[PDB]
Amino acid sequence: DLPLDPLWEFPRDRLVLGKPLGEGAFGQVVRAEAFGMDPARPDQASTVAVKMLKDNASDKDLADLVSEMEVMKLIGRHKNIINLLGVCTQEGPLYVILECAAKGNLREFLRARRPPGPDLSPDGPRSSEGPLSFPVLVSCAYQVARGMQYLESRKCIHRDLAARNVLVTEDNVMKIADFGLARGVHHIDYYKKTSNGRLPVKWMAPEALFDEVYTHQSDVWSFGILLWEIFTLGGSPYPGIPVEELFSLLREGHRMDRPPHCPPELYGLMRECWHAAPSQRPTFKQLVEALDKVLLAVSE
Ligand SMILES: CCC(=O)Nc1cc(N2CCC(N3CCOCC3)CC2)cc(F)c1Nc1n[nH]c2ccc(O[C@H](C)c3c(Cl)cncc3Cl)cc12
Incomplete structure (x- = not known):
C-alpha cells in the first residue's frame, strides 16, 4: 500500500x-x-x-x-x-x-530494585545491600542525558521525557523510547491519569503546560523530573499533589523537595533544570558534562 x-x-x-x-x-x-x-x-x-x-x-x-x-x-x-x-x-x-530492552522501562526497573526494608531477617554478608548503588544511578542519569543530547542534535524534541519512557537493556544501558511521537499537544487532558496511575502533566515544563511551547529546554525541565524519579528509585513526582493543586503551586513557583539519600550535587542539577527561564536551565550538553564529573569521581 x-x-x-x-x-x-x-x-x-x-x-x-x-x-x-x-x-x-x-x-x-x-x-x-x-x-x-x-x-x-x-x-x-x-x-x-x-x-x-x-x-x-x-x-x-x-x-x-x-x-x-x-x-x-x-x-x-x-x-x-x-x-x-x-x-x-x-x-x-x-x-x-x-530494538529490544529486556528489563522494561526505567521506572519499573528502579521500583523492583528498592533495598530490602527493616523487616527482613538478616541472611548472608549482604543483608542490607540492595541491587542499586549510587554510581549506577548516576550512570542511568548520565546515559539518558547523552541520549537526549543526541536527540537534540537531530532537532528532535521528546515532549514527554520520563522514567517510563526510558527503557533498560540486559546490560543496564538506558534507551530513550517514544521520542518521535505525535502526542496531540493541543488537546491534552491535564487531569487524565494513566492505567498505572501516572499523571503526565507533572513532567511538563511551565511554558509547555501554560503556553503550549516546546523547546529542547522544555525537555531539560522534564529531565529534571526524571532525575528526581531516579534518586527516589521510581517515585512519583509531587507526592500526593492533585493536578488542580499542581496548577497553583507551579504558578507560585513551587518546586519539589530534596529527596532522602540524595546528594546536594544532584538536587542542585534538578533545581537547575527547574529554573523558570528556559535559558537559565542547563543544556543537555552541560548536563552530560556535569553528570560525567560526578560519575568519574565515584568510579575508582
Ligand atoms: C523486546 C524485549 C522486551 O520484551 N522488552 C520489554 C518488555 C516489557 N515488558 C512489559 C511488562 C511485562 N510484565 C510481565 C509480567 O507482569 C508485569 C509486566 C512484560 C515485560 C516492557 C518493555 F518496555 C520492554 N522493552 C522494550 N523493548 N523494546 C521496546 C519497544 C517498545 C516498547 O513499548 C512499550 C509499550 C513500553 C512498555 Cl511495555 C513499557 N514502558 C514503555 C514502553 Cl515504550 C517497549 C520495549
Missing part, C-alpha cells in the same frame, strides 16, 4: 509474533522473534519489538504510526535510544520493528 523503501523493508514472514508488551494512544507493541535481521546471517534468531496499529485503527492512527516510522528513519543510530531495525509495509499490516 505504502511505497517500498528497500533500505528499511523487512520480510514480514521472517517475524514470529509473541507476547504483547504494551498499548498506547496509537499503536500497540508486540515482542517478536526475527530471523536474519542481520542479512549476513539469514537464519539467525533475534528478539525484537514490533509496533503495529490496533483493531480500532482510524486513518489518523495510521498517519501517526507512518509519521513515527519516518522519524525513526531520519534520527539514525545511537547507543542510548531505541533504534529502528526495520519496517513491514508491503502486502500486510504496517509494522515498525524496534
Whole structure:
C-alpha cells in the first residue's frame, strides 16, 4: 500500500509474533522473534519489538504510526535510544520493528530494585545491600542525558521525557523510547491519569503546560523530573499533589523537595533544570558534562 523503501523493508514472514508488551494512544507493541535481521546471517534468531496499529485503527492512527516510522528513519543510530531495525509495509499490516530492552522501562526497573526494608531477617554478608548503588544511578542519569543530547542534535524534541519512557537493556544501558511521537499537544487532558496511575502533566515544563511551547529546554525541565524519579528509585513526582493543586503551586513557583539519600550535587542539577527561564536551565550538553564529573569521581 505504502511505497517500498528497500533500505528499511523487512520480510514480514521472517517475524514470529509473541507476547504483547504494551498499548498506547496509537499503536500497540508486540515482542517478536526475527530471523536474519542481520542479512549476513539469514537464519539467525533475534528478539525484537514490533509496533503495529490496533483493531480500532482510524486513518489518523495510521498517519501517526507512518509519521513515527519516518522519524525513526531520519534520527539514525545511537547507543542510548531505541533504534529502528526495520519496517513491514508491503502486502500486510504496517509494522515498525524496534530494538529490544529486556528489563522494561526505567521506572519499573528502579521500583523492583528498592533495598530490602527493616523487616527482613538478616541472611548472608549482604543483608542490607540492595541491587542499586549510587554510581549506577548516576550512570542511568548520565546515559539518558547523552541520549537526549543526541536527540537534540537531530532537532528532535521528546515532549514527554520520563522514567517510563526510558527503557533498560540486559546490560543496564538506558534507551530513550517514544521520542518521535505525535502526542496531540493541543488537546491534552491535564487531569487524565494513566492505567498505572501516572499523571503526565507533572513532567511538563511551565511554558509547555501554560503556553503550549516546546523547546529542547522544555525537555531539560522534564529531565529534571526524571532525575528526581531516579534518586527516589521510581517515585512519583509531587507526592500526593492533585493536578488542580499542581496548577497553583507551579504558578507560585513551587518546586519539589530534596529527596532522602540524595546528594546536594544532584538536587542542585534538578533545581537547575527547574529554573523558570528556559535559558537559565542547563543544556543537555552541560548536563552530560556535569553528570560525567560526578560519575568519574565515584568510579575508582
Ligand atoms: C523486546 C524485549 C522486551 O520484551 N522488552 C520489554 C518488555 C516489557 N515488558 C512489559 C511488562 C511485562 N510484565 C510481565 C509480567 O507482569 C508485569 C509486566 C512484560 C515485560 C516492557 C518493555 F518496555 C520492554 N522493552 C522494550 N523493548 N523494546 C521496546 C519497544 C517498545 C516498547 O513499548 C512499550 C509499550 C513500553 C512498555 Cl511495555 C513499557 N514502558 C514503555 C514502553 Cl515504550 C517497549 C520495549
